[PDB]
Design a binder for this molecule. Structure first.
Ligand code: 6H6
Ligand code: 6H6
Ligand code: 6H6
Ligand code: CL
Lengths: 274, 275
């Protein structure tokens, strides 16, 4: 497909940029940096970088402009999964058949590596060589990532989740959890790409935000559906869940009304998800 | 010396600014925000904020200019302590007699509250209302904090410590300079940036200052514990002498600074005069 090729391009590109970030500045830090590299360079699909690049293109920006954005959102993502894997959280020994970072190294080193990955996400955005936007735009990219990654966004979502165990969530509560835990960062990926284009305007930003809201949820619905083929199918029944995923794809496509052909990657992604 | 009063003024001010950051934006996030507040609003002495304010004043800036800097360095510091307390690290039930965050709440919540505190540190610096410097200066503050807080600074120092075992003075100093020095130095740097009057020579001198006091503090601390350390490496009396040498280097780095740098001078003396 066109989307398969777009994904593969985004993945090669961001991977090359990320791989360069993990050189220990001195010998004593080698194992720390190897854990950082292990936590990031793990064959992930890089959906968040794809979204940054595609949002950048949708507004007419050359995609290399979003390199730093793409790296930052992937760094946030990766750190979040390392902390999530720990015994006090999800306690996961394996991710796609490979040991998780605390299992491959040790729990302290995993905690620290991921802590350093979060810092690096911000470092890369603030670095006007790696992220060479107008300074006001660099700051807005930082602001948006920090809000989305923190306790009002992704980390907050993780807290809502742990605070809902043993409660039977209704759909509205489930969606509140998803919008925080995964939606904030998806939205920030699109927002930061769009900002990197050097052509953002408030109307186009608001429309891309509607797009992102839609596809973020659509990812979760469809994930639950593929698991079958407190979940969307369990709440709704399998068939109504499938209908809901199509509704989300339609909201996503509608948000892109008026965009030029250079938004086709975002349209194609919305279809691919469902 | 008025250093105690300077410290108390810096503490009240930064505490007021920090306390305002822990309002949950909706109900479902209340307990997370409470754990964040619990992890920061613990009566700490706020040395890093003190440094940001004093560096700002040392360069003729009004101190409220450094409010965001002060908050950001304290947030990084507070998150680092919460993760350090965790069972996989130092495994402490107590911090100054009070239950650690993982005990008062739970381990996941401690991990997450601290993760959120790190994001907030960057949020506060990038927020041009809370940190109303020129844009280029906001970015340099962000750059410096990020580098100091991450795997090449504070987190790296934590890894070096974890990774160490049979260690010589140079290697001990490498560990300290990362684990504690980087953030101490960034506190001074950010405050100086916030003055609006930074320049390379002054920045460099303040960096020498920060290097010196960060180390002096660790030397004096080992000396007081008596009661792989500075006294064991050097002998108790040469360690005491080395603490004075570090204070002197700190004070020499501030040669030529005006009287408004007096808080930094008094702080350097205080570090080696305690007990
Ligand atoms: O599994 C693969 O390697 C290709 C699958 N794949 C694709 O074709 O487009 C995608 C967009 C986002 C994530 C995965 C995608
Ligand atoms: O802890 C007190 O209230 C008095 C001790 N104290 C002081 O007098 O100045 C200080 C600077 C930093 C940390 C502690 C300091
Ligand atoms: O972490 C703290 O707040 C207490 C330790 N501490 C202090 O009280 O004065 C210091 C000066 C330099 C480095 C650490 C110092
Ligand atoms: Cl389709």
């Amino acid at each position: 497909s066109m989307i398969a090729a777009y994904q593969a391009r985004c993945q090669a590109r961001v991977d090359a940029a990320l791989d360069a970030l993990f050189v220990a500045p001195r010998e004593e830090l080698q194992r720390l940096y190897e854990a950082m590299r292990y936590s990031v360079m793990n064959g992930g699909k890089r959906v968040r970088p794809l979204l940054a690049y595609a949002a950048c293109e949708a507004l007419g920006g050359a995609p290399q402009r979003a390199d730093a954005a793409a790296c930052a959102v992937e760094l946030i993502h990766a750190y979040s999964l390392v902390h999530d894997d720990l015994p006090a959280m999800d306690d996961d020994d394996l991710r796609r058949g490979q040991p998780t970072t605390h299992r491959a190294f040790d729990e302290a080193t995993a905690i620290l590596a991921a802590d350093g990955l979060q810092a690096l996400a911000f470092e890369v955005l603030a670095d006007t060589r790696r992220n060479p936007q107008e300074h006001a735009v660099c700051l807005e990219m930082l602001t948006r990532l920090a809000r989305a990654a923190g306790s009002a966004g992704m980390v907050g979502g993780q807290a809502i989740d742990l605070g809902s165990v043993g409660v039977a969530l209704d759909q509205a509560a489930l969606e509140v959890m998803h919008r925080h835990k995964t939606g904030a960062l998806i939205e920030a990926s699109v927002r930061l790409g769009a900002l990197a284009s050097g052509r953002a305007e408030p109307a186009s930003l608001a429309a891309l935000e509607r797009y992102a809201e839609a596809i973020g949820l659509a990812f979760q619905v469809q994930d639950d559906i593929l698991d079958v083929e407190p979940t969307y199918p369990a709440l709704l029944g399998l068939e109504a869940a499938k209908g809901y995923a199509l509704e989300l794809r339609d909201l996503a496509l509608a948000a892109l009304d008026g965009f030029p052909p250079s938004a086709d990657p975002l349209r194609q992604l919305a279809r691919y998800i469902v």
